[PDB]
Amino acid sequence: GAHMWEEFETLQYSRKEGQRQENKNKNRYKNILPFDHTRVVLHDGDPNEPVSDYINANIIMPEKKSYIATQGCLQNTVNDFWRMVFQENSRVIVMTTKEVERGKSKCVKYWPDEYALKEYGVMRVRNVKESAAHDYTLRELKLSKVTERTVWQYHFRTWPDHGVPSDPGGVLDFLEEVHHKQESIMDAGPVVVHCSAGIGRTGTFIVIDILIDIIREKGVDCDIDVPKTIQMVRSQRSGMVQTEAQYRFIYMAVQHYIETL
Secondary structure (H helix, E strand, C coil), rough: CCCCCCCHCCCCCCCCCCCHHHHHHHCCCCCCCCCCCCCCCCCCCCCCCCCCCCCCEECCCCCCCEEEEECCCCHHHHHHHHHHHHHHHCCEEEEEECEECCEECCCCCCCCCCCEEECCCCCCEEEEEEECCCCEEEEEEEECCCCCEEEEEEEEECCCCCCCCCCCCHHHHHHHHHHHHHHCCCCCEEEEECCCCCCHHHHHHHHHHHHHHHHHHHCCCCCCCCCHHHHHHHHHCCCCCCCCHHHHHHHHHHHHHHHHC
16 A cells, blocks of 8 residues: 655656746745646736736646645735635635744734734635644634635644654644545635645645545555655646655555554
8 A cells, every 4th residue: 555665766847927027026935936837827916916917826636626735925925825715716724834933934924813804905804713723723714805705724733843743643633624624615626735835845735635535535455656646746836745754754644544444
C-alpha cells in the first residue's frame, strides 16, 4: 500500500500573469507564481483598476473533489481572497499556519473576531461561532456580497514552527473532519488550502487528502503511487511538497490511515 519505493530527490509551464508589473505587490514571494493554465482568474473587479483578475492561487484537480492552493493573504490581497472564495463557491478553508510564526508574518488576519462582522471590499464576513479543538479551531463564517453562505474555516493549530508533525494523528483527525464537512454541503466548490507561499504545507495536506480519497474508493489494497501523484499536482502549481520531511510525512499519514481500516 503506502510503502516508500523512491527517494524524494528523484522528484526534482508559463507564469506570465504573475510576472506582470501590475501584479508584483500581490505576490508574497517574488518567484513563487501560479501557472497561467490553472490560475484562479478573478472576475467582476473594480473597473477603475486596470488589473483586477489576479490572485496567487491555482486550482488542483486530481487525475470528485478539487482544491485551490494559495498563499496566505497580504494586507492588500485580503479583499481579493474573499472575491476568490465567493466566486469559486468554496465552503471550506484549510489554514495550515499561524498568522505569525517565529516572528515572521505568514498570513494577514482575513477573518473577524468571534461575534463580529467586517466588510472586506464588496464582501461581508460574520464570524458566528468558534470551536477550539486540540489540533485546530473551526470558525463558522457567513459570507455575503454587500448572497450568504457558510464558509467553514479549519485553522490548524499545531504544525511545528520547524519541520513536520512527528506523528500524523492530528492531521488525520483534522482531514477527516474537513472530508465530512465538505461532503455534508451539497455541490460545495473547491476546498481552499493555504500556508505562507502555498506550496510546502499546502502541497503536503492536498497530496495526503488525494491519496486517502483513493483508499476510500478502492480500499486498502493498492495501487497507490505517491511520486506519480506529486508530479500530477506539480503540473498544476510549481513545486508542491517542498521538503524531504514533508515527503516522508505523506507516506506516514497514508500508512496510518490504512491502519484505521
